[PDB]
Design a protein around this ligand. Structure first.
Ligand SMILES: OC[C@H]1O[C@H](OC[C@H]2O[C@H](O[C@]3(CO)O[C@H](CO)[C@@H](O)[C@@H]3O)[C@H](O)[C@@H](O)[C@@H]2O)[C@H](O)[C@@H](O)[C@H]1O
Length: 634
């Protein structure tokens, strides 16, 4: 007879416990996840034109797309009960499975319309032969306020992958509109070569009757990963049956990668997944003036290759330009990356699905936002993409969660010293404006959606810590630590120029007891925020299912001019700890999320950490405890 006692040592084998015994142990309170069961890819988000409510979707129990709605982008309500499903397999187009999809707010019958990957055969993986007809794209229309999606009574509207192309995958259609694409396709192939003519047409563009484009993710056996582009036939905004194939607007060589050493954006891998096409500005999303950005997941593998196994799941982002379709007979249009990085450096972060969130939305109206935004929902698989070594899934009763909604826009880093640090090849940023003395840098901006950040701190207990410096190695416990695993830790770390060349490691130790701790620090050596989980869980040693490997992401701190002097850019940290779900944010342009499954209720001390190498200044350190409930109606 074993009842859970989180103040006592964990049993040696967690998988021997009764189903659901671990249900609340690591479960978050402020994140998006079903009431129970497993959550897969986030997909099918859209602002309902009628109600202005923002709809969120996600695969659930490998049995279809489930959903929820929100009015504030802080609290959520399930569309229904018993799974809250919107659409499931079993149709003629989708006898085996229902994969990711995207929604056109005003589609068929002028109602929200879902274009999704209908599945008829399994297995499907880039490492094995593709079964013809495995993945097709079908339509379904929203009924009863989006609480369900009825499949149109006909076959798929894109019933096959490109003719005779040996695709490694063909799925996760994502819809978007683009002024630049309509122009490039509307103009002559000779007159669409000079930006002078283009830009002019781009200004007359009208978002309302523009045709929808569709990017499908996958690759080509023996050649490369790629995104397949389609658009309503003939650019007719009212054509929903036929979609003309524009070609592989973006493809890369098998297991190639941004930069020579693949340092800043992992690798393009063997297959591209759940692509998203964004158009940014310094303030939000604008399909007319925004720069072209694409977020995607890439499947990697070492050698030899393990059939049906993707050893690496990188959550990347790329930005660049779109031009005519070269001179050859390839794609009508091509996307050329200028920069690329990670949307989230977490091993278990993947399949992000975002959506434009209009200023006209009930969400932006209520919060006072008056610009169009692009909110992105990143997936945090719960069992390492189903490769976990015996995770106690039956015991937990649920699997996975989505990360906090995030705003994506163009973030600028001003007053930067245009130095080798800036002029490196294959990085996650481009020089905006430089006088060879100081330049502005452009990169993907990553922040917690404002309404969610506010809700996280609204009723939280706040406890500051005095600024302090550490030269010699030390681990200093905060004056006061929270008494629960639900909090937001904020701090700024100032480093002296002499630290770049040192083995310095500075940060914090969270979720700490004498038998447990989780280290989060910055390493100048490879320049990377690190989350050491080797001591995170007292239960991990005998339960390999609880992964404890190190997580880390590259974050460069540039030399800049602050008060009128040069200094190493301040490390601005924001760590949200949702019981076991941990998200590390840095400089409004870095994210590293992972699972920190601490066990003891006592495991809640926070400590300052410095390894004695170099010197670090902690400024403005504080903690907000409590966070909030994202599912009030449950
Ligand atoms: O190959 C065996 C495998 O086939 C099916 O999964 C295929 C596909 O799943 C994952 O792809 C994503 C990324 O998270 O998840 C959804 C599906 O749930 C896809 O639309 C999306 O690309 C993997 O990352 C891919 O490597 C994999 O090829 C099936 O669902 C699995 O249970 C298993 O049978």
């Amino acid at each position: 007879s074993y009842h859970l006692d989180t103040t006592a040592p964990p049993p040696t084998n967690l998988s021997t416990l009764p189903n659901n015994t671990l249900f609340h142990l690591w479960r978050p309170r402020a994140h998006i996840l079903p009431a129970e069961g497993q959550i897969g890819d986030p997909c099918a988000h859209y602002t309902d034109p009628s109600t202005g409510l923002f709809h969120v979707g996600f695969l659930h129990d490998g049995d279809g797309i489930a959903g929820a709605t929100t009015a504030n982008l802080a609290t959520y309500t399930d569309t229904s009960d018993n799974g809250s499903f919107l659409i499931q397999p079993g149709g003629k187009n989708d006898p085996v499975a229902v994969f990711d999809g995207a929604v056109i707010p005003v589609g068929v019958n002028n109602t929200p319309t879902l274009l999704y990957t209908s599945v008829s055969f399994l297995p499907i993986h880039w490492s094995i032969p593709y079964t013809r007809g495995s993945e097709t794209q079908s339509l379904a229309v929203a009924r009863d306020g989006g609480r369900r999606f009825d499949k149109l009574d006909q076959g798929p509207v894109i019933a096959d992958h490109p003719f005779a192309v040996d695709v490694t995958a063909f799925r996760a259609p994502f819809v978007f509109r683009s002024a630049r694409l309509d122009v490039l396709l509307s103009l002559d192939e000779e007159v669409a070569r000079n930006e002078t003519a283009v830009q002019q047409a781009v200004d007359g563009w009208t978002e309302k009757n523009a045709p929808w484009y569709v990017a499908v993710s996958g690759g080509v056996h023996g050649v490369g990963p790629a995104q397949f582009l389609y658009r309503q036939n003939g650019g007719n905004a009212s054509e929903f049956q036929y979609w003309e194939y524009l070609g592989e607007w973006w493809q890369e060589a098998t297991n190639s990668s941004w930069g020579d050493e693949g340092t800043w954006a992992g690798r393009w891998g063997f297959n591209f997944e759940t692509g998203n096409v964004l158009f940014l500005t310094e303030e939000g999303h604008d399909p007319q003036t925004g720069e072209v950005f694409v977020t995607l997941g890439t499947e990697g593998s070492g050698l030899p290759i393990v059939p049906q196994v993707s050893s690496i799941h990188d959550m990347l982002w790329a930005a660049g330009e779109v031009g005519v379709g070269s001179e050859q007979e390839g794609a009508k249009v091509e996307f050329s990356p200028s920069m690329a990085g990670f949307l989230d450096w977490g091993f278990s972060a993947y399949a992000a699905a975002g959506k434009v969130l209009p200023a006209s939305s009930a969400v932006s109206k209520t919060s006072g936002v008056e610009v169009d935004r692009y909110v992105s929902f990143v997936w945090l698989t719960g069992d390492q993409y189903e490769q976990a070594d015996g995770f106690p899934t039956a015991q937990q009763g649920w699997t996975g969660s989505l990360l906090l909604p995030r705003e994506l826009k163009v973030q600028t880093v001003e007053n930067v010293v245009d130095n080798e640090l800036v002029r490196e090849e294959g990085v996650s940023w481009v020089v905006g404006e430089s006088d060879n003395q100081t330049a502005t840098l452009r990169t993907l901006g990553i922040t917690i959606a404002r309404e969610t950040k506010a809700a996280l701190l609204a009723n939280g207990s706040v406890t500051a810590e005095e600024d302090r410096t550490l030269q010699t190695a030390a681990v200093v416990p905060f004056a006061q630590s929270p008494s629960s695993k639900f909090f937001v830790l904020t701090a700024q770390l100032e480093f002296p120029a002499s630290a770049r060349s040192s083995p310095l490691q500075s940060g914090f130790e969270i979720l700490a007891s004498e038998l447990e701790r989780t280290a989060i620090y910055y390493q100048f050596s490879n320049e990377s925020l690190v989350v050491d989980r080797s001591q995170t869980s007292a239960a991990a040693p005998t339960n390999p299912g609880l992964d404890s490997f190190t997580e880390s992401g590259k974050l460069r701190l540039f030399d800049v001019i602050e008060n009128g002097q040069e200094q190493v850019e301040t490390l601005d940290l924001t760590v949200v700890v949702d019981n076991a779900v941990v998200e590390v944010y840095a400089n409004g342009r870095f994210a590293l999320s992972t699972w920190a499954r601490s066990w003891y209720d006592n495991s809640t001390q926070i400590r300052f950490f410095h390894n004695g190498e170099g010197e670090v200044q902690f400024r403005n350190v504080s903690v907000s405890e409590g966070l909030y409930n994202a599912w009030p109606e449950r």
